[PDB]
Paper text:
O-antigen acetylation by AT3 domain-containing acetyltransferases of Salmonella spp. can generate a specific immune response upon infection and can influence bacteriophage interactions. Multiple Salmonella serovars have a rhamnose moiety in the O-antigen that can be acetylated at the 2- and 3-hydroxyl groups by F2GtrC proteins. In AT3-SGNH proteins, the AT3 domain passes an acetyl group from an unidentified donor in the cytoplasm to the periplasmic face of the inner membrane. This acetyl group is then transferred to the SGNH domain, which catalyzes specific carbohydrate O-acetylation.
We expressed and purified residues 366 to 609 from OafA (OafA-STMC-long) and residues 377 to 640 from S. Paratyphi OafB (OafB-SPAC-long), which have 31% sequence identity. No diffracting crystals of OafA-STMC-long were obtained; however, crystals diffracting to a 1.1-Å resolution were obtained for OafB-SPAC-long, with a single molecule in the asymmetric unit. The structure could not be solved by molecular replacement using a number of known SGNH structures but was solved using Fragon with a 14-residue ideal polyalanine α-helix as the search model and refined to an Rwork/Rfree of 13.6/14.9%. Second, and most significantly, the region that connects the end of TM11 and the start of the sequence of other known SGNH domains (residues 377 to 421) is clearly structured and forms a long extension of the SGNH domain that we now term the SGNH extension (SGNHext). The structure of OafB-SPAC-long shows OafBN459 to be within hydrogen-bonding distance of a cocrystallized sulfate ion, suggesting that OafBN459 could interact with bound substrate and participate in oxyanion hole formation. OafB-SPAC-long contains a GTNG motif (OafBG502-G505) close to sequence block III, but the side chains of these residues are oriented away from the catalytic triad.
Numbering used by the authors: 380 to 640
The structure:
């Protein structure tokens, strides 16, 4: 039905608009500053990382607007550029190390109240060995603390991932069983992400920063959240894992009060 008709997920979900592509996501530094992506006011929440970090913007914006909060949002994100100093290239063939040097320099300039970070743990320029990944994050943490000693640093952990595009997993369930799946499910759910979330829950707080489990916010004993309504416009992920607007909104409804007291 409606789920089977979504065959081009990036066009259907307006994926560029979702991440603020061409404005704050995957842009040159002079464009980022001119477009107002780096705020200098009080109560500034400064997002850094790859497209998983960009996907947080919608839910945080919605939480602030719904609460009538005076908090503001900065964003320096780029596809295939985690907030880790790894010698790889982003989607525009730029140096991931150069991009992270520029992010640290802007954090130093504006002294934000909060730095909010995440990445795609299985992505091209991620770090696959969990212990070496903690060591790489420790280098970023030390640079942020030196640049802006009063900033709170918050790592929002990995979101749930699926074995194909989530809309295709739901279409597959309907074709096999001719029944709508449950709201929370393990059908088509990737088993590795829970292991990353558990490792970070145990080890990140000892590094002198805050950890928020996105996985525990979106998952329960029945599995992980597929949707907040009937049809493709209400599912939680664009592809295997990048949050839709409804997915991002649900996450921040759950975790926003851990960021804004």
């Amino acid at each position: 039905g409606e789920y089977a008709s979504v065959t081009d997920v990036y066009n259907y979900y307006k994926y560029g608009e979702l991440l603020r592509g061409g404005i704050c996501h995957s842009v040159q530094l002079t464009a980022a500053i001119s477009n107002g992506c780096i705020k200098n006011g009080k109560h500034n929440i400064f997002i850094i990382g790859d497209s998983y970090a960009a996907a947080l913007f919608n839910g945080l914006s919605h939480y602030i607007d719904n609460k009538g909060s005076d908090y503001i949002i900065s964003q320096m994100t780029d596809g295939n550029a985690p907030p880790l100093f790894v010698d790889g290239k982003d989607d525009l063939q730029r140096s991931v190390i150069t991009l992270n040097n520029n992010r640290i320099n802007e954090i130093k300039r504006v002294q934000p109240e909060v730095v909010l970070l995440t990445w795609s743990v299985r992505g091209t320029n991620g770090v696959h060995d969990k212990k070496l990944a903690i060591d790489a994050l420790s280098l970023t943490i030390k640079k942020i603390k030196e640049a802006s000693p009063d900033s709170r640093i918050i790592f929002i952990g990995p979101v749930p991932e699926w074995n194909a595009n989530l809309v295709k997993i739901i279409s597959n369930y309907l074709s096999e069983f001719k029944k709508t799946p449950p709201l929370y499910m393990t059908y088509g759910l990737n088993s590795e992400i829970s292991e990353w979330d558990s490792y970070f829950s145990n080890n990140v707080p000892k590094m002198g920063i805050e950890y928020i489990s996105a996985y525990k916010a979106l998952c329960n004993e029945s599995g992980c959240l597929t949707r907040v309504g009937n049809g493709p416009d209400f599912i939680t992920a664009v592809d295997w894992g990048h949050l839709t607007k409804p997915g991002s909104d649900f996450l921040f409804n759950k975790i926003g009060n851990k960021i804004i007291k």
